[PDB]
Coordinates of C-alpha atoms and ligand atoms in Angstrom, one line a residue:
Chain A
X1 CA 0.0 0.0 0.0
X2 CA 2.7 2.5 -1.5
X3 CA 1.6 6.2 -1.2
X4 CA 3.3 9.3 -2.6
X5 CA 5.0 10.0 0.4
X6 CA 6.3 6.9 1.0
X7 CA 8.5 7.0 -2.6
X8 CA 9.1 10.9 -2.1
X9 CA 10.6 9.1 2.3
X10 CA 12.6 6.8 0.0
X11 CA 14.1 9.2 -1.9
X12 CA 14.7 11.8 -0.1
X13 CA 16.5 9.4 2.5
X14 CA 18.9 8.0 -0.3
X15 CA 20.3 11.1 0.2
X16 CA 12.7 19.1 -4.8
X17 CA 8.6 19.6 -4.0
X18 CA 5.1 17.7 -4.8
X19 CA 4.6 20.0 -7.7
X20 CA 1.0 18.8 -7.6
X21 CA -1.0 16.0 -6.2
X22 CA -2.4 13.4 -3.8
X23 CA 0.7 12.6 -1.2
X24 CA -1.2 10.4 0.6
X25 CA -2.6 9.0 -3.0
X26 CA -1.4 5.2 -3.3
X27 CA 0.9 4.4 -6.2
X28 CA -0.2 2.2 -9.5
X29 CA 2.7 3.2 -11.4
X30 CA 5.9 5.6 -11.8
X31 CA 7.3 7.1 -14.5
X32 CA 10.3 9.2 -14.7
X33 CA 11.6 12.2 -16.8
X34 CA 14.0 15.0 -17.1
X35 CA 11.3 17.8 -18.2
X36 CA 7.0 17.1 -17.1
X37 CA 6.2 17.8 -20.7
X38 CA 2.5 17.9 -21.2
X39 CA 3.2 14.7 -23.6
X40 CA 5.1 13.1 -20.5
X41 CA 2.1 13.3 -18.7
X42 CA -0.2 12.4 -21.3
X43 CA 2.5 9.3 -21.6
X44 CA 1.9 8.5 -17.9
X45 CA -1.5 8.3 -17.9
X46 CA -1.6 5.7 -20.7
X47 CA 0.9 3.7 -18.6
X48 CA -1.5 4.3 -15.6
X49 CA 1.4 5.9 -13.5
X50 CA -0.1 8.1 -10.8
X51 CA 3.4 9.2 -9.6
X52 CA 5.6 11.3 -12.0
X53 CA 9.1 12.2 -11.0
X54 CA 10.9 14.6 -13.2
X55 CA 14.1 16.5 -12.7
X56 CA 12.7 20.2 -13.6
X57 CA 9.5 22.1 -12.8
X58 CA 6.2 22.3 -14.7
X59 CA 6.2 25.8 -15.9
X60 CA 9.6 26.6 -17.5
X61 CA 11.3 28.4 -14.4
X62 CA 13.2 27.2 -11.8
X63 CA 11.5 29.6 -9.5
X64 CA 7.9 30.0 -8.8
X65 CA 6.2 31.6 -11.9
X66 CA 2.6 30.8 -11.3
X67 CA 1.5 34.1 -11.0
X68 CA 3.1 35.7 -14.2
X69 CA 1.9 32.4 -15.9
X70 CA -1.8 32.7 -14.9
X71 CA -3.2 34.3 -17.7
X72 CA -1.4 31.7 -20.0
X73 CA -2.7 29.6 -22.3
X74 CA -0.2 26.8 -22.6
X75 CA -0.1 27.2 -18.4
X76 CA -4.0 27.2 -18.2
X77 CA -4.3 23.8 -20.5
X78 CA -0.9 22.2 -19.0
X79 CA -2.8 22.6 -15.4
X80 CA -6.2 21.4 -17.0
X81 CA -4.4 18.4 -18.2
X82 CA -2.6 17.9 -15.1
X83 CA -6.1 18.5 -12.8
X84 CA -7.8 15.6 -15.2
X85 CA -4.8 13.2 -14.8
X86 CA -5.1 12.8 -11.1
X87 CA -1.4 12.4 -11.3
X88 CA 1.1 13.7 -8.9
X89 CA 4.2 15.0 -9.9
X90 CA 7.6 15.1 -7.7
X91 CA 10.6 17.6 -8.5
X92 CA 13.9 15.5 -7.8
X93 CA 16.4 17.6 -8.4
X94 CA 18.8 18.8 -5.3
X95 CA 19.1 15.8 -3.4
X96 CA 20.1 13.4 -6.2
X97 CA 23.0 15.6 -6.9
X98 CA 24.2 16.1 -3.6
X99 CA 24.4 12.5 -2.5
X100 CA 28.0 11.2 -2.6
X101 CA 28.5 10.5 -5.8
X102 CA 26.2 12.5 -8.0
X103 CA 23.4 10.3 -8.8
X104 CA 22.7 12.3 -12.3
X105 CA 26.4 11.7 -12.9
X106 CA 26.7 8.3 -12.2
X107 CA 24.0 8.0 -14.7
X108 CA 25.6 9.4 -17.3
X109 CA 29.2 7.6 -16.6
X110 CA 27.4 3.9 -16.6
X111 CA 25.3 5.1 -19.7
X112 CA 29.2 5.9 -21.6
X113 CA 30.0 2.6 -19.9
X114 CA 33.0 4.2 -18.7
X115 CA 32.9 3.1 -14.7
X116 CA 35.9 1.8 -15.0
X117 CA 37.9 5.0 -16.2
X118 CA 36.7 7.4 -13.4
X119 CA 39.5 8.8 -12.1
X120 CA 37.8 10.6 -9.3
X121 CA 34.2 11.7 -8.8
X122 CA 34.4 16.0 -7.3
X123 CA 31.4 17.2 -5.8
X124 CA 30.3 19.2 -9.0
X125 CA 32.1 17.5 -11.6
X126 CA 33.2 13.9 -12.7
X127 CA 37.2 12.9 -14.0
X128 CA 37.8 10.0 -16.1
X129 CA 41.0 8.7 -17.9
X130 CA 40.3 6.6 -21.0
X131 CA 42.6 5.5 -23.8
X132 CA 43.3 8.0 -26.3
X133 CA 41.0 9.4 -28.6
X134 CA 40.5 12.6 -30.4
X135 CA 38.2 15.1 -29.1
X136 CA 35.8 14.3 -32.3
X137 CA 36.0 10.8 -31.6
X138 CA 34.7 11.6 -27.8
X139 CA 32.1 13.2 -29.6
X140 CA 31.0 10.6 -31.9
X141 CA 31.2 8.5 -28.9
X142 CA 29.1 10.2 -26.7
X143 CA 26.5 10.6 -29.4
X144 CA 26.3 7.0 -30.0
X145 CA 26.0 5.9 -26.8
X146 CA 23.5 8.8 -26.1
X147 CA 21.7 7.9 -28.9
X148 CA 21.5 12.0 -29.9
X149 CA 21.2 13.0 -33.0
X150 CA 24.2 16.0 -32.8
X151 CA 26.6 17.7 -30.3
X152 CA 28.9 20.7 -30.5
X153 CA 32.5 21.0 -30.1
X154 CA 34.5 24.1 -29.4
X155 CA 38.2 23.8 -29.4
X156 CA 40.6 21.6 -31.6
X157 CA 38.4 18.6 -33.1
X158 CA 41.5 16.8 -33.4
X159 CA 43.4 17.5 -29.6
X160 CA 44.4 14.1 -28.0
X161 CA 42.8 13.0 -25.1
X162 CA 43.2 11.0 -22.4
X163 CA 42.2 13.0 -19.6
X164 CA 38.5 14.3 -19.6
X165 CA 36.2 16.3 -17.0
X166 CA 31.8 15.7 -17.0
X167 CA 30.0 18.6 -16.0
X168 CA 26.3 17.4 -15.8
X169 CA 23.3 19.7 -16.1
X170 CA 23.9 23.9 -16.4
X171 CA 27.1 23.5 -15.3
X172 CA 29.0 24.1 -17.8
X173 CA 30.1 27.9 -16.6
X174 CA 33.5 29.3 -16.6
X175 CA 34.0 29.6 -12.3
X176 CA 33.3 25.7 -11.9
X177 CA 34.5 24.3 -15.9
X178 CA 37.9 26.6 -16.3
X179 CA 39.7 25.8 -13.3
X180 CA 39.5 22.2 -14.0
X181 CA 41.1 22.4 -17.2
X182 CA 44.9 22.7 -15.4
X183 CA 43.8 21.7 -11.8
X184 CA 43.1 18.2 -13.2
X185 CA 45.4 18.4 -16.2
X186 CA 42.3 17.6 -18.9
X187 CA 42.7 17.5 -22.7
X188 CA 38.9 18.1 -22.5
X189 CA 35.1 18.9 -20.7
X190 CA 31.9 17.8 -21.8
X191 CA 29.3 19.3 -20.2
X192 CA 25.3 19.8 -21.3
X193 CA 24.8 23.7 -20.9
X194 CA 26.6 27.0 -20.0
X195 CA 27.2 30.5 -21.1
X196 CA 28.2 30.7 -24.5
X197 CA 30.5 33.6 -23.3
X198 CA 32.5 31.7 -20.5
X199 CA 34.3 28.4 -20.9
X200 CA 33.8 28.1 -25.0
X201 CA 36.0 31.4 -24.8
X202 CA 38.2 30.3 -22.5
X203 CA 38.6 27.4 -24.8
X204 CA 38.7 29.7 -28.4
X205 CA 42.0 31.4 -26.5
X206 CA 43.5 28.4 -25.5
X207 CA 43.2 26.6 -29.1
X208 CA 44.8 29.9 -30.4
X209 CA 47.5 30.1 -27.6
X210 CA 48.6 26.3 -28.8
X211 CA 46.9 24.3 -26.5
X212 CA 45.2 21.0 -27.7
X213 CA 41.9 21.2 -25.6
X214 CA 38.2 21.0 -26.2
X215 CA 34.8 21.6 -25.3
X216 CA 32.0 18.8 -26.1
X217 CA 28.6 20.4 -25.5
X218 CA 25.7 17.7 -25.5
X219 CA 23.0 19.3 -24.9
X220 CA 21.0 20.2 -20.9
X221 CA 19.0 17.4 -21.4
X222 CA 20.9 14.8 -23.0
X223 CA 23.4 15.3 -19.9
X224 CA 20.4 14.5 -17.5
X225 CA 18.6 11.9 -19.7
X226 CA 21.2 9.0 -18.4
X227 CA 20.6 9.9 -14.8
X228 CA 16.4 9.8 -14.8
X229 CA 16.7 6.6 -16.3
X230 CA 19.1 5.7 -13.7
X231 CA 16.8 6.9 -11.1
X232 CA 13.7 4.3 -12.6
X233 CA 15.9 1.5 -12.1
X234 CA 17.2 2.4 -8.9
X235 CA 13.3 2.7 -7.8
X236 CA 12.1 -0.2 -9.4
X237 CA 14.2 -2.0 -7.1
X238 CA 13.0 0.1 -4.1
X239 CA 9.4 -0.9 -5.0
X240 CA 9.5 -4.3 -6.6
X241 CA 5.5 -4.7 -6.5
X242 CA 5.6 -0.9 -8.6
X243 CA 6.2 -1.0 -12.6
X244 CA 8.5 1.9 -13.2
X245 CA 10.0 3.6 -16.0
X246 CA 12.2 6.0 -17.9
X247 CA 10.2 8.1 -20.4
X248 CA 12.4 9.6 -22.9
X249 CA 11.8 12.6 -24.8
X250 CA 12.8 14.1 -28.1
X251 CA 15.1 16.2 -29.0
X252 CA 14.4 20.2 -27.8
X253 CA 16.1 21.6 -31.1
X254 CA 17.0 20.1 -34.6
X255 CA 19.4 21.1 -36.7
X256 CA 19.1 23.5 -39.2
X257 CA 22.9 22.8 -41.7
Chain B
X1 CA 43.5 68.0 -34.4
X2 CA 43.7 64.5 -33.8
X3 CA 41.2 62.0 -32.2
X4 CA 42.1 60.4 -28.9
X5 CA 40.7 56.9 -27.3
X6 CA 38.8 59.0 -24.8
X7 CA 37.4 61.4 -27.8
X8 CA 35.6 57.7 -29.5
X9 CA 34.0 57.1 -25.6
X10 CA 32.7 60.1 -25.7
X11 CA 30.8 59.9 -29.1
X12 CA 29.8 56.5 -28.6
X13 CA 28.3 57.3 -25.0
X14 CA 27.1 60.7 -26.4
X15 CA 23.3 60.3 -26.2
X16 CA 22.8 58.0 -23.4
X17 CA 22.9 59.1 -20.2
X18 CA 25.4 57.6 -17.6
X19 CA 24.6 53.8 -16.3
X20 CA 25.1 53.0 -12.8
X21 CA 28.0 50.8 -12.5
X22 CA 28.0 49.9 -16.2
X23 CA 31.3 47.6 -17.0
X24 CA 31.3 49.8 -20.1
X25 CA 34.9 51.0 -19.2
X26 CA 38.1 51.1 -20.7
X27 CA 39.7 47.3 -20.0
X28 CA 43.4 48.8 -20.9
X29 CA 45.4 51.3 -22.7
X30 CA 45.9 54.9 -22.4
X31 CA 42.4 57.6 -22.7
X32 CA 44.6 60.1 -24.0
X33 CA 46.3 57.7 -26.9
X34 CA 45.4 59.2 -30.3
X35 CA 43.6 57.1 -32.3
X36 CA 45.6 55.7 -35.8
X37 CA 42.4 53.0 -36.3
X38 CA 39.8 51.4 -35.2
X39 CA 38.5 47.8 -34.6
X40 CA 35.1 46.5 -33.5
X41 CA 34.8 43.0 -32.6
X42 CA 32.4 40.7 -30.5
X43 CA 34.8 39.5 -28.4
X44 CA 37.9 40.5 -27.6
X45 CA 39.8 37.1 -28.5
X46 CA 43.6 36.2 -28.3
X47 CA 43.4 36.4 -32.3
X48 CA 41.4 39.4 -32.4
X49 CA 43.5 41.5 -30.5
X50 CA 46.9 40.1 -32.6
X51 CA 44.8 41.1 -36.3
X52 CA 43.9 44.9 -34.2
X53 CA 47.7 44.8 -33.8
X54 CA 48.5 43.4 -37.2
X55 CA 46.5 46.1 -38.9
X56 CA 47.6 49.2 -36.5
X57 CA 44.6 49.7 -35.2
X58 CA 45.1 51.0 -31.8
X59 CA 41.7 51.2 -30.5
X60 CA 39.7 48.0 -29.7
X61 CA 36.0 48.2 -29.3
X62 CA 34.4 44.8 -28.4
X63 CA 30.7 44.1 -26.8
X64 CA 32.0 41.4 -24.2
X65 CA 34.8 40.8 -21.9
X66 CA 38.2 39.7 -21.7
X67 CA 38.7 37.1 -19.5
X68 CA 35.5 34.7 -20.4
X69 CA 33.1 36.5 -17.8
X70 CA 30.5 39.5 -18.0
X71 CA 32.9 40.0 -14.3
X72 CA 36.9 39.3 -14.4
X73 CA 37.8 36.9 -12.4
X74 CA 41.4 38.1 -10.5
X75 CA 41.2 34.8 -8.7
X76 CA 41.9 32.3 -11.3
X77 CA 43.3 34.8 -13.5
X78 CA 46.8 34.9 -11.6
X79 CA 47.3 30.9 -12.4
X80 CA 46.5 29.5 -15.8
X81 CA 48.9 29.8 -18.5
X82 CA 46.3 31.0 -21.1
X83 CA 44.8 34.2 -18.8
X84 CA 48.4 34.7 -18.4
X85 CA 49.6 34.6 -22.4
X86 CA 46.4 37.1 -23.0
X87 CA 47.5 39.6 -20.1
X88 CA 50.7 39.5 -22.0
X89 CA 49.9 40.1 -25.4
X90 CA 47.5 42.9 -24.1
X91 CA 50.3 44.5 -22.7
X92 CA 52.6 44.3 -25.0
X93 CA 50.0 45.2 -27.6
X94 CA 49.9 49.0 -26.8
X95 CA 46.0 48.8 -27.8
X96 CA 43.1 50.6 -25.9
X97 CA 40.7 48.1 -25.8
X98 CA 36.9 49.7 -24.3
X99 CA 33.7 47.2 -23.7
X100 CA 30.6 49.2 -25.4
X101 CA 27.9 47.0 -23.8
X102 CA 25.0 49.1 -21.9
X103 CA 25.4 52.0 -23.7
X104 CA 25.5 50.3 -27.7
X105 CA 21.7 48.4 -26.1
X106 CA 20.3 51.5 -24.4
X107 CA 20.8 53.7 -27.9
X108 CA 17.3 54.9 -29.4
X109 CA 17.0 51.8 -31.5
X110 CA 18.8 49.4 -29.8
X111 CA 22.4 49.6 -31.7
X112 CA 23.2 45.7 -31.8
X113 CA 19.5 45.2 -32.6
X114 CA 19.3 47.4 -35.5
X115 CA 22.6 46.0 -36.9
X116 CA 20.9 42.3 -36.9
X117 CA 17.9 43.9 -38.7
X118 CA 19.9 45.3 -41.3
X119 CA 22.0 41.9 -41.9
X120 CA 18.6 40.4 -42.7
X121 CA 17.7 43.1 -45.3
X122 CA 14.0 43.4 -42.3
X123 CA 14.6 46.8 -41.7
X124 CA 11.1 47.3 -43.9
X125 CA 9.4 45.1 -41.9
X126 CA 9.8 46.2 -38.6
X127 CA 6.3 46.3 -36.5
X128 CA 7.7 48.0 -33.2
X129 CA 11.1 48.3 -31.4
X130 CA 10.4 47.5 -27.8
X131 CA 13.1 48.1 -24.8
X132 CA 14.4 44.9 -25.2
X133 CA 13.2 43.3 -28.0
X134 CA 11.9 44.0 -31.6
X135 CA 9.0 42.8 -33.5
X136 CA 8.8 42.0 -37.1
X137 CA 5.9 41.2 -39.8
X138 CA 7.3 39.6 -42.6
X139 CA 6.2 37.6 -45.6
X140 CA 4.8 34.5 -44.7
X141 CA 7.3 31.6 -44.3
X142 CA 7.5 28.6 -42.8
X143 CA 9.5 28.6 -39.0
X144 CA 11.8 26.8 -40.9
X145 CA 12.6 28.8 -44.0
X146 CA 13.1 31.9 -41.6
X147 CA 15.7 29.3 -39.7
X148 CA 17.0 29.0 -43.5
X149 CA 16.5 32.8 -44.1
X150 CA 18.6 33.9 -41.3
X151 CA 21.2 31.4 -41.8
X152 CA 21.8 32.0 -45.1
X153 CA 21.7 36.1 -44.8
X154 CA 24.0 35.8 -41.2
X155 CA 26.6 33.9 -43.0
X156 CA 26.7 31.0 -40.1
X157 CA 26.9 27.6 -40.1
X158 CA 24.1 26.1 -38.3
X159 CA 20.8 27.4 -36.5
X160 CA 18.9 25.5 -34.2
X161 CA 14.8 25.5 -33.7
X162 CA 12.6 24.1 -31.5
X163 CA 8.5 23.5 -32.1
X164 CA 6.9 23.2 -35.6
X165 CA 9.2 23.4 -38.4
X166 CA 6.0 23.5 -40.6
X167 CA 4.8 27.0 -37.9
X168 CA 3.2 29.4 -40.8
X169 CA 5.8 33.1 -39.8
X170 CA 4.3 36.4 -40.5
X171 CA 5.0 38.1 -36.7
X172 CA 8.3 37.5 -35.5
X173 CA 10.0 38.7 -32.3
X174 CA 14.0 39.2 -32.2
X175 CA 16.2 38.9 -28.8
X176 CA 19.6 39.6 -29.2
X177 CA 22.4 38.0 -26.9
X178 CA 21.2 36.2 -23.7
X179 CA 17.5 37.6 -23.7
X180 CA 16.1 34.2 -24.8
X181 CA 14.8 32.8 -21.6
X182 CA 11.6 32.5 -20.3
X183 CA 11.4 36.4 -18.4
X184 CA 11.3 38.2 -21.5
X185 CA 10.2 35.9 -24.1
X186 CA 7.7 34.2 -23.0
X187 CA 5.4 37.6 -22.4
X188 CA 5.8 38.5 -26.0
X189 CA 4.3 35.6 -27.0
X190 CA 0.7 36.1 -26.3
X191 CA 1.1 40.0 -25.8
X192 CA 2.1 40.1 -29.1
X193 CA 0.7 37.2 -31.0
X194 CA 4.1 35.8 -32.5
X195 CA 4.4 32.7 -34.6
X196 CA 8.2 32.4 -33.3
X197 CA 11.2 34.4 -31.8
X198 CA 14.4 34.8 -33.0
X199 CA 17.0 34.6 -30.1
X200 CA 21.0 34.7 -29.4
X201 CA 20.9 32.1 -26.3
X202 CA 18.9 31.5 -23.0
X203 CA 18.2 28.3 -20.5
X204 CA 17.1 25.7 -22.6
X205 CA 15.0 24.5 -19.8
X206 CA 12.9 27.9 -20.4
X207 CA 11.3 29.0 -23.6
X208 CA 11.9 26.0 -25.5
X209 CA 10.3 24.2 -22.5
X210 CA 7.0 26.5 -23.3
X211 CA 7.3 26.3 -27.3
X212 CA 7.7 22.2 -27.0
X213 CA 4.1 22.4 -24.5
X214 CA 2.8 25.1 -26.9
X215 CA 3.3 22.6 -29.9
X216 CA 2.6 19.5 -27.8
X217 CA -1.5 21.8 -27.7
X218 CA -1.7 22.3 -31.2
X219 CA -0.2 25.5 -31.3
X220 CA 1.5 26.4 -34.5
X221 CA 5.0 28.2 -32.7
X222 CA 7.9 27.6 -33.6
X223 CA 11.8 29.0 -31.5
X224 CA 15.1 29.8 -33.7
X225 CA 18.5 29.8 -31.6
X226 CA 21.3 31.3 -33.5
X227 CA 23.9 31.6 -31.2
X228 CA 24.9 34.1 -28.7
X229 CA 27.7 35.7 -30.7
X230 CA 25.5 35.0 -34.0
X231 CA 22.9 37.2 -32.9
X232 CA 25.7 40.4 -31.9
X233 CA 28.0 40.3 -34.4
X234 CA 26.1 42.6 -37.0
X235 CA 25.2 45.0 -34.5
X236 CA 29.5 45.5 -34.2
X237 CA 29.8 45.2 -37.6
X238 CA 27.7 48.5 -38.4
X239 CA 28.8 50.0 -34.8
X240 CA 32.3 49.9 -37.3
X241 CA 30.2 51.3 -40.0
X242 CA 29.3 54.1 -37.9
X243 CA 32.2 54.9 -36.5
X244 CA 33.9 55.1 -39.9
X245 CA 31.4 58.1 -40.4
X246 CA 32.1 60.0 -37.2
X247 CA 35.7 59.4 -37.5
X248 CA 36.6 59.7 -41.1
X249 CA 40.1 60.3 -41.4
X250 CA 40.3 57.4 -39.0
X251 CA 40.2 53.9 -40.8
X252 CA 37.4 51.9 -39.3
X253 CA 37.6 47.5 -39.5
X254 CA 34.9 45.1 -38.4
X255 CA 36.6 42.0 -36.9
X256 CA 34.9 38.5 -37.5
X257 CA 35.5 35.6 -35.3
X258 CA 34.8 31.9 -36.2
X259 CA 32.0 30.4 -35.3
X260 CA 32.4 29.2 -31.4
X261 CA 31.2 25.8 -32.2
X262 CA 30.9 22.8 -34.8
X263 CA 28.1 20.5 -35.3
X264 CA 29.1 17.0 -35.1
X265 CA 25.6 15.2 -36.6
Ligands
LIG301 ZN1 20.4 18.6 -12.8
LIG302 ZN1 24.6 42.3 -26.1

C-alpha cells in the first residue's frame, strides 16, 4: 500500500517539492523524466502511473512563476491536463545531486559505460581517464552511446585525449569548468549547458595560444537523460511490486545545416 | 587636431545618459592615446586582438569581456597559463581596448538590434522596437525557411529551432544576446501574438520548454537559436560602419570571429 509519500521518504533518504498532487494518494505506477512535458504526462496516464518524478519544474522556471503564468494559455491547459490526470508529480532535483557520488552523474558515466575509467568523482564534476582518442572521436562516442542525434564541439576537433572532465546539467560555466582544465590536467570537458561567453571562450583562446583542448557540448537534457533513467531503475528495485519507468523525450532543437 | 581613445568614448556614450556601475569601461590602454584605427569585434579574443595589432589599429571596441566572464575573475586569472599569455599580449600590444555594452543596447534603436535587422535586409518590416526586443511582420514563411532565411543572410553555419518546423511566420520577435529565456520571451508571446522568436541564447529549460508544450496543444510556434555571438556580431559590424562616419580620417575594420562551435551530426 505505496503512497506518494512513501516513494518521495525513500528518496529523499537515499540522500525538490510535490509540484502537484495526492501525497497520501497510493501508487499504480511511476514514470520518470527529465522535463513534465505535457506529452510526458499524457505518456503516464496511458501507462496508468499516478506518480511522475521529473528533474525540472512544470512551468519553464526554476522559480515560482505561477503568477506571471496565470493568464497563459499553454499554463492554463498544462494545469487542465494535469487537474484531469489525477497524477502527482515530484521535482527531484537537489538531493540526487548532492548525495556522494552525484546520482545524475553516475547515470551518465554507466550510460558511456566508462565506470571503470573514473578517475575521481568531485562534488560538481566527474574525471575520467580513457585510452586515447581525439576530441571528435569523444564526440561521436558520446552521441552514439546517447543515442543524440548532434553535439557541439568548441576547441581543436582533433586535440588528443586521455584526460576528460563531465559537468552534468547547467554547469557548464567558466568559475566551476575553467579551473578544472589545469587543476586536473584535462585535454577536455563535456558538459550539457553553459554560457556561450565563459568556458567556450576560455577554450577559443586556448586553441589559439597552442593548447590542444576542447569543449564537447551535448545538450541540458541529453546530460540529465542518463541519470532519470538511472533513477527508474534504482526505484524499481525500491518498489519491486511498482512498474516503473524511464520516459524519454525528443530532442528540444534540430538542426538546421 | 587628432582624435584620442577618450574622444571615440565620448561619441559613442554621447546620447545615453550615464549607467550606474556599467562595466562599459576602458579594459586597458591609455584615454589620451590618439587614435591611428579602429576595430570592432564581439569578443575581444587572443586572435582578435593580434589582427587589431596586425592592422595598427590601436583602438579595440568589443561588446564582451576579456577574461571569459561578464565580471573578471582576478582569482583564477593569476594561475593559468592562457589568462596569463592574453595579459601579455594585451600588454605588449599597446591597444586601448573599451567594452561598449550598456550603452550600444540603451541607444534609441537598440544599436546591436538594429545591426541584426539590417543583416537580414528586415529593416522594412519592422512592427515596433520594444526596450528589449523588436517585433517584425514579414512575408509569410515557414518557422523553418526563416531558420533557412537567417542562416543563409547571417553567413553562419548552423541554427537550431525548436516547435513546428511547418509554424506558418508572418509576426516575428527578435532577442539579441542572452534575452532568450523565459522572463522576456515568453510575455511576447501572447502579448504580441508571435508565430516564433528569434534569439541569441537563453536556459534551454525555459522558452523551449514553453514552445515544446505550446506545440505538444496544437499550437502552430515555432523558436530559432542562433547563437549568442551569431545574434551580436552585426550590431558591431555596423557599430564599425558608424564609426567610420564619425571618424573619417580614422580607418574603421569590423573584426569577425569563427564560429564558437561545430556540429558533429
Ligand atoms: Zn540537474
Ligand atoms: Zn549584447
Amino acid at each position: 500500500a505505496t503512497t506518494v509519500q512513501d516513494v518521495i521518504e525513500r528518496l529523499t533518504a537515499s540522500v525538490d517539492t510535490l509540484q502537484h498532487g495526492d501525497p497520501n494518494m497510493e501508487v499504480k505506477g511511476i514514470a520518470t523524466s527529465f522535463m513534465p512535458t505535457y506529452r510526458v504526462i499524457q505518456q503516464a496516464v496511458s501507462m496508468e502511473a499516478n506518480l511522475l518524478i521529473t528533474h525540472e519544474g512544470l512551468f519553464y522556471s526554476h522559480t515560482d512563476n505561477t503568477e506571471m503564468m496565470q493568464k497563459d494559455s499553454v499554463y492554463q491547459e498544462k494545469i487542465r491536463l494535469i487537474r484531469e490526470s489525477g497524477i502527482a508529480i515530484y521535482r527531484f532535483h537537489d538531493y540526487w545531486h548532492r548525495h556522494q557520488p552525484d546520482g545524475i552523474m553516475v547515470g551518465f558515466i554507466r550510460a558511456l559505460e566508462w565506470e571503470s575509467y573514473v578517475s575521481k568523482y568531485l562534488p560538481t564534476a566527474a574525471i575520467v581517464a580513457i585510452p586515447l582518442m581525439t576530441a571528435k572521436e569523444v564526440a561521436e562516442y558520446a552521441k552514439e552511446m546517447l543515442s543524440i542525434p548532434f553535439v557541439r564541439i568548441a576547441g581543436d576537433l582533433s586535440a588528443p585525449c586521455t584526460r576528460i572532465g563531465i559537468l552534468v546539467g547547467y554547469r557548464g560555466g567558466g568559475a566551476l569548468s575553467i579551473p578544472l582544465f589545469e587543476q586536473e590536467h584535462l585535454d577536455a570537458i563535456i558538459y550539457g549547458e553553459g554560457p556561450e561567453w565563459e568556458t567556450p571562450e576560455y577554450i577559443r583562446d586556448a586553441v589559439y595560444q597552442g593548447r590542444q583542448k576542447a569543449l564537447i557540448v551535448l545538450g541540458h537534457a541529453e546530460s540529465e537523460e542518463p541519470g532519470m533513467k538511472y533513477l527508474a531503475e534504482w526505484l524499481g528495485e525500491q518498489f519491486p511490486d511498482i512498474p516503473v519507468h524511464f520516459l524519454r523525450e525528443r530532442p528540444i532543437f534540430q538542426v538546421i545545416h
